[PDB]
């Protein structure tokens, strides 16, 4: 009876920016998501293919926990089927995405009165992007990687909303993560 290391991705000091999101492959875990769901300190807990009370008792083989920092106004548009300034240049989901997206308000950490100029988002691209793909290419398009201008008093839609995106996946392999 070993439990999955969710503490290394839910409890981190510096979440990476949106264009260079950290991916952590999870296998051979036991993941009790009732500790996550019944915390009630998250803002938007949307699920997109499993019911949020039903997700405990079914198995999987590998679940990817993507994680990044976006503006609060753009948390809704990382759902499937929506394309905006974020969801075609930085992180785009497929239309049959199987997983839950978890987000909360994080104005405590990532805010400075002069600015927090280190979270970067890819403003301009040559063409659009294929889902589940990243590109750290800081070449001239016009410098594309502008930073979020963050502040403690900027707007409840412009506070940094640290979002971790689960991604369940079941392939032709013996499923392990059941709980």
């Amino acid at each position, epitope marked *: 009876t070993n439990l999955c290391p969710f503490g290394e991705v839910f409890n981190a000091t510096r979440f990476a920016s949106v264009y260079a999101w950290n991916r952590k492959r999870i296998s051979n875990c036991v993941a009790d998501y009732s500790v996550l769901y019944n915390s009630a300190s998250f803002s938007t807990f949307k699920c997109y293919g499993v019911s949020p009370t039903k997700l405990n008792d079914l198995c999987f083989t590998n679940v990817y926990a993507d994680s990044f920092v976006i503006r609060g106004d*753009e948390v*809704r*548009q990382i759902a499937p089927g929506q394309t905006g*300034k974020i969801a075609d240049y930085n992180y785009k989901l497929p239309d049959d995405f199987t997983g839950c997206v978890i987000a909360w308000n994080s104005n405590n950490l990532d805010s400075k009165v002069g600015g927090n100029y280190n979270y970067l988002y890819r403003l301009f691209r040559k063409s659009n992007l294929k889902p589940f793909e990243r590109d750290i290419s800081t070449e001239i398009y016009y410098f594309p990687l502008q930073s979020y201008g963050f502040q403690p008093t900027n*707007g*409840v*839609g*412009y506070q940094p909303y640290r979002v971790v995106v689960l991604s369940f996946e079941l392939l032709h392999a013996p499923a392990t993560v059941c709980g």
Partner: antibody
Amino acid sequence: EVMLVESGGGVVKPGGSLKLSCAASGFSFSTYAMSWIRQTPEKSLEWVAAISSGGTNTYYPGSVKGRFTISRDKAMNTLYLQLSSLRSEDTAMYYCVRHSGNYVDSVMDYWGQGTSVTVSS
Amino acid sequence: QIVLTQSPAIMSASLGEEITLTCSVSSSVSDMHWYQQKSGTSPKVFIYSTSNLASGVPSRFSGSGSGTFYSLTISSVEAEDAAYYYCHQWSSWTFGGGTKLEIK
């Protein structure tokens, strides 16, 4: 039917304090989010406070930061907004609104009657 | 930060005309609501999510807009619709300047 009332709006000289209370009646109280908007004498609205459903997250702008402490009640189906350390510009008509989603992000459907607090002499 | 500019302060529209009301932002926001307040009563909601209509409001209040421009359409202006009109998004901390629609 959704019904909101307000009270407590009196007169306090600058430097003093005052407590308001928005009583709710007509819905499940501990599921929807509420916030307080003041109305300037030039009739220009701005937030002063906003609280989520579970009473865990509160947001205030930079003009009233540090003193306007909002609070939600679980038992008696009211909503308190406490003010302290006033200034000369904070005289306004203070409404009590209700959101439709469980966070602050959604739109404000039902509004209270609004009390007018005056800082003078 | 975000400012909401609505120009002019008062638009002119005699009865039967079709006028639209503007709402612009500095940094590009995803949507914009629309509120209505008469002289002496509390404000009420007209439009959320830039196109949906609130409860008990006639079917001429259907606006549109995206990016840095959000417009409020009224097809047949009626003399009851003489109120102060505010647009306000989630990411504001401050409403628009407010435009009052008068009848010529």
